[PDB]
Amino acid sequence: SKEEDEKESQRIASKNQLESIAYSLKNTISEAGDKLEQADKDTVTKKAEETISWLDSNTTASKEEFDDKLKELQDIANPIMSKLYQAGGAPGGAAGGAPGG
């Protein structure tokens, strides 16, 4: 039937893009050396690698599940990306706006 083909091709796209994003998270940390702390940096990249391992282990999951992984990856990465950006990643003017303290 067409149904399986449709779903499979989407699962492929989902795997591919999710995989790419995991590498993108680590790629971002590659310039984040002094900009991020070792703990949050390890947290995102470790999770990214877990994400890569998850894809290989759960290739048998549907694209909804790959989306789910993408979402939870993005959720945890979001604040850490944000702290990266508001330092020297997001355009502020001089530098990233410090929260004060």
Whole-angstrom distance, CA of residue 98 vs CA of residue 94: 11
**Token reading at 71:** 């979402």
Whole-angstrom distance, CA of residue 36 vs CA of residue 6: 41
Q: What residues does each domain of the chain span?
A: 1-97
Find out whether 47 and 26 touch, Cβ atoms under 8 Å.
no
Q: Assess if CATH 2.40.37.10 describes domain 1-97.
A: no
DSSP tag of 85: H
